[PDB]
Design a protein around this ligand. Structure first.
Ligand SMILES: CN1CCN(c2ccc(-n3cc(-c4ccncc4OCC4CCNCC4)cn3)cc2)CC1
Length: 308
C-alpha cells in the first residue's frame, strides 16, 4: 500500500526516464487539475532525501523548482514538485549546438538569480550543472536537486575534489563558471575520458578559449574560473558585473517574488470551499507550511492563477 495516501490526492501519469536515487513520475493534482512531477525514493535502496526536503521547505523562489508536498510510507518518500515540461538546460544547449552570448545572458541571469538567493538563505547548492536546471512552461529556468546542499566531477571546484576545506559559495561560483562556458561553447572547458586526466586538467585550470567568445565573455570566465577560491568573483559582484548588465542596465533581481508571509486572497477563497474553517483558521493553517495536501493545494492554485 505504498501509493494509497498519494492516490487520494493525485492521478498518476507516466514515469519519465531518470538516473539515480529517485524515480520521477508525472501526475495531476485531483482538486486543481494541475500537473506536477513526483520524485519517488525507495527507503531500503536516506540522508540526501532529508537534506533536500529541509532545504526546499526553506527556499521559495521564481527560479527554484517548488516543493509542494512531502508524503512518507515505511518503504517510500514522495516529493511533489513544480512541473517543468521544457526539459533540462543540458538537452537545450545540445539541441542548439551552443547559445549566442545574448541567449546565454538571458539564461545565465536566471541561474545567478536562483544561486544568489540560495546563498542569501544560508545555503550552497554544491551540484550546479545543466542537468540540474529545468525549463518550465514559460521557458523560465528552475533549479533542482538540493540533495548535496550545505548550510559531477566536470563541474566541481579544484578544492572540492581534493577534499580540502572550502566555502560552498566559492564552489558554486566555480560551477557557474563551468556552466557559463558550456552555454557559450557547447562543450566542457575541462574534459577527458579518463577520470585522473580530468582531475589533472581541473587542478591546472587551463582551458581553450574559442574564437567566437567576446573579450567581455573571456574576462568574466577568468573571474569565475580561478583555481584559488579566494580569487573568484563574489556573488554580490556577479549581480551587477558589466557582462551581466550588458543589454539590461539593471543588476540581476535575485530577491524572491514567491512569499511565505503574504497569502493570495483569491487562492485562500478557492481553497476554503474544500474545508470547514472560518477564514482566519484557514489562513493560519496555510501559514504553517506543513507541506501536506493543504500546502500543495494552495501553491497549485497560485500556479493556476499565474497562468491566467
Ligand atoms: C510529453 N512531455 C514529456 C516531458 N514532460 C515532463 C518531463 C519532466 C518534468 N519535470 C521533472 C521535474 C523534476 C523536478 C525535480 N527534480 C527532478 C525532476 O525531473 C528529473 C528529470 C530527469 C530526466 N530529464 C528530465 C528531468 C519537474 N518537472 C515535467 C514534464 C512533459 C510532457
Amino acid at each position: 500500500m505504498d501509493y494509497d495516501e498519494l492516490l487520494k490526492y493525485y492521478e498518476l501519469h507516466e514515469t519519465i526516464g531518470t538516473g539515480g536515487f529517485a524515480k520521477v513520475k508525472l501526475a495531476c493534482h485531483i482538486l486543481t487539475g494541475e500537473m506536477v512531477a513526483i520524485k519517488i525514493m525507495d527507503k531500503n535502496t536516506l540522508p540526501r532525501i532529508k537534506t533536500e526536503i529541509e532545504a526546499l521547505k526553506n527556499l521559495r523562489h521564481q527560479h527554484i523548482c517548488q516543493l509542494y508536498h512531502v508524503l512518507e510510507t515505511a518503504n517510500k518518500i514522495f516529493m511533489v514538485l513544480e512541473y517543468c515540461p521544457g526539459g533540462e538546460l543540458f538537452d537545450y544547449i545540445i539541441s542548439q549546438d551552443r547559445l549566442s552570448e545574448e541567449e546565454t545572458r538571458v539564461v545565465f541571469r536566471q541561474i545567478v538569480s536562483a544561486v544568489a538567493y540560495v546563498h542569501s538563505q544560508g545555503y550552497a547548492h554544491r551540484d550546479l550543472k545543466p542537468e540540474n536546471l529545468l525549463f518550465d512552461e514559460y521557458h523560465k529556468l528552475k533549479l533542482i536537486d538540493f540533495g548535496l546542499c550545505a548550510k559531477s566531477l566536470a563541474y566541481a571546484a579544484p578544492e572540492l575534489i581534493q577534499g580540502k576545506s572550502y566555502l560552498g559559495s566559492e564552489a558554486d561560483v566555480w560551477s557557474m563558471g563551468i556552466l557559463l562556458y558550456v552555454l557559450m561553447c557547447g562543450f566542457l572547458p575541462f574534459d577527458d575520458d579518463n577520470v585522473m586526466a580530468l582531475y589533472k586538467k581541473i587542478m591546472r585550470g587551463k582551458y581553450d578559449v574559442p574564437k567566437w567568445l567576446s573579450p567581455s565573455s573571456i574576462l568574466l570566465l577568468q573571474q569565475m574560473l580561478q583555481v584559488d577560491p579566494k580569487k573568484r568573483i563574489s556573488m554580490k559582484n556577479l549581480l551587477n558585473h558589466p557582462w551581466i548588465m550588458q543589454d539590461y542596465n539593471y543588476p540581476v533581481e535575485w530577491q524572491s517574488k514567491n512569499p511565505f508571509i503574504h497569502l493570495d486572497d483569491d487562492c485562500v477563497t478557492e481553497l476554503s470551499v474544500h474545508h470547514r474553517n472560518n477564514r482566519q483558521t484557514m489562513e493560519d493553517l496555510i501559514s504553517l507550511w506543513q507541506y501536506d495536501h493543504l500546502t500543495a493545494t494552495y501553491l497549485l492554485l497560485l500556479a493556476k492563477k499565474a497562468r491566467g
